[PDB]
């Protein structure tokens, strides 16, 4: 059981709880950027700089 | 006259404080005068009082109402403050009359 | 008397892991409290964010 | 110090369940929604009526505002 | 003592205001306000210093140096947005909590009452400097329309407002002083607020019933700091969906424009929250009188602790004074749109009604239908 | 040569039943306006409703036909 | 004097709250304006840097500067000087003072188009529909001497000439330079000029929904949770009756 | 960080003023709880002994 | 004032050389910034003497 596992692990203990909240927050972090990211560039294929960049990027 | 004797029962359903179990006296801003007449009410109308507010309290944190079949009806509410109230009210007028005299 | 008084019925309101009165409530409590410690957890991971 | 010294009370009694017993939001469609509901209608013929009344005057003075824009062609008839 | 949290000089402050302080248990979402307004103003005051560290207050440099932030500095355009946008938020809160204490009769609470009266005026008064400092079209004019108005007092006209300019008419020497001042009032607000706060503990809060919850009370913590969080988000997400997604929706484009003594703008109207007093003001044709309305319109305030005729706190078992509680609304709405019209026929005559009614509604209406509920009571 | 599909558009669309109605307003205007010596008259009301109606036409499609 | 009519809404590639600008069309503007506009407009708030990364890479940004010669000094006698721009100048103005920009304008001023887009209501849907919405004036209508018939103007008399027709220029890039193609993408190009922060606003947009959309319903439970002591509570009164 | 830039420059005196405008506040609101702790024990007396007998 | 590397100083001058008393309003702020730390030094002594600090 996870929730059990979690609770005894992780929420129990006040110390463990905020090393969950701040080592989540750093993963939350790392992937809930890339995931907007990755929505936003999507909805707005060729259109951003980071898209149409090649065709004079050649020095 | 019977006319407004029904409007009164009209008023008494529009205003809506019989759904939460509340006398008419229950929904009396506290002034001064109602203050010194709750102080005199008999210790069993006070603490039927009490729990009739409380309990209309819980109701109103809840968003929610007593069943139909609890409501308070018109020709069943009872002023049972209304005459401590109007004593209270002739002893201060005399007093005020009296300390201008 | 007080013995003439019980607490009313919360099976409204009870966790289905304790909504029978003959089972143990513990073995489910930190399911229960895991889950709702889980979410505020959650709460502050997204406002650490 | 305010806890203590607030009200007289007498024989009441209370009875409450730990938050971790219980369901944070029970019976939404046996209770919680008929009760929105119930106190939807109970309002909506008070609050309602005056916004209503507020559109119409509002309806009726832009689009009469705009109606004294155009032009009467009874003041060219004339020529 | 055996807990550090009543003992401490301190502490006991923090524990007797936001913690150990008794509430009542049935208040609803309408006292979330009061919160959302302190962290309102917390808010302006940082986002305000923020902007302040890149702004000059100087008619040649002002409109740019508020470009330069929005163009340069890191994150300039979203602290310029939310500095400007808060305001709206702080406004919209504002009357939401107004609007509360009139429905539950909250001012009965006279001191705490007057002190809020007080906070809307010092709040008034700090947005609209604050509007001028961007030295935009509107800033200008806006700041040229209302000040003059004031010339019209008899005698100490010209002076008052010639001093106030610091010259012959809103020039540098005002942008200057109303920097000063728009940087100076938000701290009178935080101050006054404290006052706000002391008067309403000798009490505690009123509840949507209006009758003694001193039968039921409950900590403050953590019932409605969880409740006032949760309110803070979701009001917090309407701003921001605002602030992100249509930046400029309640602004007025005239303000893109450099502030021009010789060009004035076909429109000069307030921000949404001023409108309804701008139609007051122009319902009135005589300078003198319409300032006054326009005073009134707002010192009204202080005298609704002395209509009170019902025997009854609030309006929730009053179906009479429900209906006229948002009839006044209604009439605001009405006024707010009068507000942002051209001074012409219907919009003319619409106006002064609802000037009108606006007065009558809290001057003589409600004093009488709440006598006549408590006839209906049998009273 | 080349070709503005604004132009194109524009044609298409004054061929509507709501642009033909309001052109039609506006030609009728124009005469009489055009053949009288002390008149105050102006078209410009005509014209914007013919306009209104057109260019809310053009809206719709010119955008589709350019990059 | 009196009566106006209102632009209609364009479709923009960049509407969306989510959807950011075409960067390619804000390239071309740029060249619209570079070689049309930036004749009589000036645009003070924008500096060659701005485009690097946005539409110009950091040589072809370099490069364009260097096409301008900005006025420095003093030197060491005190004297002002000439010299080719650097990425940190702003686009050049095209008069000294709005004086000499209204002695060549027939005493019209164009203005700064810096924030046009927003200091206009309507925004890019106006300027477009004014750039391609010249004609002659109708029945009952005379233009003064030196004023130009738009509809879209107010008062409808323009002191600013038809500023476009088809091929009045050459996109790079191989885009057909229609008339209306023009003002599309310059109208783009303004958008952007008003706000560079545009795109980042947006996405920003994007994150602030899904975690306000993430964290209120945490806290809603959070909140129920806790109150669900006192919304399940029951009580009774029991008097020695 | 502290100079907005790389010297002493408009950047640096510009957030300054902004300062020294806000810190006096800070300094009145401080002394406010300046006094608050002082009227705790109230104030000490040049002969170190205690002024009770005497207030 | 003016916060302005290049109108701080001479807004400072305008202000004594044109303001209504600006030049008395400069000098009190000004040396009223000495007669601060001249009190606080007394009163820092006063409280090292008397063990105030207690
Ligand atoms: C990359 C980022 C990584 C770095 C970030 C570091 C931040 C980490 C912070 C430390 C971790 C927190 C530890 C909390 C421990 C205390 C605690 O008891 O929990 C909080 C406690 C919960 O009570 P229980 O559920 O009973 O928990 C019992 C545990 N057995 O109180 C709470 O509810 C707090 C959490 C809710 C947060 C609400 C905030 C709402 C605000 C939203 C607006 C947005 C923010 C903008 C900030 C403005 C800044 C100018
Ligand atoms: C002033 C400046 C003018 C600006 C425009 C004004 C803003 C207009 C926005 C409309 C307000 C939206 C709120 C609609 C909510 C409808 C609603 O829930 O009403 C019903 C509900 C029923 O309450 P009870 O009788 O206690 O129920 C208990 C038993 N079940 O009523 C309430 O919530 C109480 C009303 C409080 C909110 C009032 C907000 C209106 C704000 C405007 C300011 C008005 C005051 C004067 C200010 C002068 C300066
Ligand atoms: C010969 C100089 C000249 C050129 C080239 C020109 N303009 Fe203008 N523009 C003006 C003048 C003059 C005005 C002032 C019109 C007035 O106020 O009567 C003006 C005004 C404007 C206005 C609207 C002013 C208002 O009050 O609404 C906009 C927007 C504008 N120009 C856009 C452009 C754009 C985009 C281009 C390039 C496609 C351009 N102009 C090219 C001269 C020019
Ligand atoms: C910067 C503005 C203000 C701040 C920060 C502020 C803050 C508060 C706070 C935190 C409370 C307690 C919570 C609540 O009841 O909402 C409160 C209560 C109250 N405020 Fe304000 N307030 C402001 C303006 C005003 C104004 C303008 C008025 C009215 C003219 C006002 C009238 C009241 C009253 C009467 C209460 C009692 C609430 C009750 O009935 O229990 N406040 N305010
Ligand atoms: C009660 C809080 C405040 C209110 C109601 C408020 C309101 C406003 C308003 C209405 C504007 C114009 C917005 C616009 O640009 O359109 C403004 C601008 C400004 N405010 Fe505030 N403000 C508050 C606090 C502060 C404080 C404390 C400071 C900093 C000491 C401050 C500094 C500024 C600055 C620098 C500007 C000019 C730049 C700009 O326009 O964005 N404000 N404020
Ligand atoms: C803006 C600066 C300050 C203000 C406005 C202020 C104000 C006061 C006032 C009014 C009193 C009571 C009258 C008196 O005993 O002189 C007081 C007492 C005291 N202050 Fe300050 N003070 C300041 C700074 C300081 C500093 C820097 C210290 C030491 C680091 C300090 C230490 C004390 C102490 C220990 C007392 C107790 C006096 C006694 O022995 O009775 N104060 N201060
Ligand atoms: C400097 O002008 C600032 C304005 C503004 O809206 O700031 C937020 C403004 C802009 C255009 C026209 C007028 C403006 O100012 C105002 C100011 C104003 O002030 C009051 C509001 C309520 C009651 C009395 C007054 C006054 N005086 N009521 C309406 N408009
Ligand atoms: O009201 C409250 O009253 C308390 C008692 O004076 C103060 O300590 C708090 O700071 C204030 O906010
Ligand atoms: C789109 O450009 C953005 O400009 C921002 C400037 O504030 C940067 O912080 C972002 O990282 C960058 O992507
Ligand atoms: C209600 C709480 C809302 C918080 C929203 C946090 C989202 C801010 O996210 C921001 O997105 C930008 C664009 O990707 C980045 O450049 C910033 O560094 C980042 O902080």
Redesign the pocket.
Known sequence: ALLRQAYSALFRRTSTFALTVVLGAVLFERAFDQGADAIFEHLNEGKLWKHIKHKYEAS | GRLMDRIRKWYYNAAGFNKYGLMRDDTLYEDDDVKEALKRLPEDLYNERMFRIKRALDLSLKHRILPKEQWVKYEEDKPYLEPYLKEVIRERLEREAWNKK | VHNDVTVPDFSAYRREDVMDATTSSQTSSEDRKGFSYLVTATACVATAY | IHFGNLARVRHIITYSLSPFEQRAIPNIFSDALPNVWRRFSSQVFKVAPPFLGAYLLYSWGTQEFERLKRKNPADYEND | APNIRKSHPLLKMINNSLIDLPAPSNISAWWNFGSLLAVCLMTQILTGLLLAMHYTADTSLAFSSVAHTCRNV??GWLIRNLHANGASFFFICIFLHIGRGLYYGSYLYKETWNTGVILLLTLMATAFVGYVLPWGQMSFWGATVITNLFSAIPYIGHTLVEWAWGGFSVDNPTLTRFFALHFLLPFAIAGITIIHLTFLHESGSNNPLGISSDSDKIPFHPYYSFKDILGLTLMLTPFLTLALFSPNLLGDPENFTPANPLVTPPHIKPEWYFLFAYAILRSIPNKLGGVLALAASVLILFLIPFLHKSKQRTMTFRPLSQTLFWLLVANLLILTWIGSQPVEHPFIIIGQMASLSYFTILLILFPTIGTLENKMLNY | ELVDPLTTIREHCEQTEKCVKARERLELCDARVSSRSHTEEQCTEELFDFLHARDHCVAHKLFNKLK | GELELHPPAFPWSHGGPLSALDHSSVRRGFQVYKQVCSACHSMDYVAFRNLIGVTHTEAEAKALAEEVEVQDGPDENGELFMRPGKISDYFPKPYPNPEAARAANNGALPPDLSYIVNARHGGEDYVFSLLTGYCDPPAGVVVREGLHYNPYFPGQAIGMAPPIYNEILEYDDGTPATMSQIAKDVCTFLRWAAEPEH??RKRMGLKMLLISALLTSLLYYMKRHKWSVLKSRKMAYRPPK
């Open positions: 890191q994150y | 795109d980042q």
